[PDB]
Amino acid sequence: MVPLPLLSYTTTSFNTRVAGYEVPGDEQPQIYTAENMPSGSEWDTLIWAAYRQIFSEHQMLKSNRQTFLESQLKFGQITVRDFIGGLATSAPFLERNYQTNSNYRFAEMCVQRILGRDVYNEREKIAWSIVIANKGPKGFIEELLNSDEYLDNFGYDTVPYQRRRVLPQRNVGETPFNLKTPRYNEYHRTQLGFPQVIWQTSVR
């Protein structure tokens, strides 16, 4: 089989594409790296940051915790990159985030959480959606973690973060990705026959 190349898409103007001539301040994302030989407590903070990035805060349940992946990471058997791949390919992630979304929206969510940037255009979502259809969600995550964009920004040992959310002269940056892209959209909300209206006012 000839490998079908990724469909070409146009790039958009984003803060992450320009050089930032910035002095470190309180709005800079805290970098969690394994390179500094982390203490036993620093490993727990790095693991916590990786779960927050990939699952969101509301999905940090005791039942979603990948204890075997955490022990492999703490023993140095796997890299932080491989841990992120293991989280994004985990059963609780696929059940909660893959099965409740279309391939297009799942691609957008993975780009935001793993590459730490927004999608350039709707054509990038279409280009990644065919990778998900052909290789499954696992092969899509592996292709995203093997991108030069991932390696150049995070390497093997850094937990992904939202790149350049705030400009140094602004008290208000871009919306956090966890608020911008919640677990599911309006389309899956209508299927669940959920919230919206569930009360009959009063009798009179």
Ligand X SMILES: *[C@H](C)[C@H]1/C(=C/c2[nH]c(/C=C3N=C(/C=C4\NC(=O)C(CC)=C4C)C(C)=C\3CCC(=O)O)c(CCC(=O)O)c2C)NC(=O)[C@@H]1C
Contact residues: ligand X, CB under 6 A: 7, 13-15, 17-18, 20, 56-59, 103, 126-127, 129-130, 133, 167, 169-170, 178-179, 182-183
89: nearest Cα among 157, 122, 136, 125: 136
What Å distances lie between residue 80 and 1, 4, 73, 108, 167, CA to CA? 32, 29, 7, 22, 28
With CB under 5 to 8 Å by kind, the binding choice for 31 among another protein, ligand X, none is another protein
Residue nearer to ligand X on the CB measure, 3 or 76: 3
Residue nearer to another protein on the CB measure, 11 or 75: 11
Residue ranges that bind another protein, judged by CB under 8 A? 1-2, 4-5, 8, 10-14, 18-19, 21-28, 30-31, 36-42, 44-45, 48-49, 52, 57-59, 61-62, 166-169, 171-173, 175-176, 179-180, 182-187, 189-190, 192-200
Question: What's the closest the beta carbon of residue 66 comes to ligand X, in angstroms?
Answer: 17
Q: Let me know: does 33 contact 73? Beta carbons within 8 Å.
A: no
With CB under 5 to 8 Å by kind, the binding choice for 94 among ligand X, another protein, none is none
Question: What's the closest the beta carbon of residue 204 comes to ligand X, in angstroms?
Answer: 27
Q: Return the bridge partners of 33, or none.
A: 158
- 150 vs 81: CA distance, rounded Å: 9
With CB under 5 to 8 Å by kind, the binding choice for 41 among another protein, ligand X, none is another protein
With CB under 5 to 8 Å by kind, the binding choice for 152 among ligand X, another protein, none is none
- 28 vs 147: CA distance, rounded Å: 24
With CB under 5 to 8 Å by kind, the binding choice for 91 among ligand X, another protein, none is none
Residue nearer to ligand X on the CB measure, 46 or 178: 178
Residue nearer to ligand X on the CB measure, 8 or 201: 8
Residue nearer to ligand X on the CB measure, 89 or 100: 100
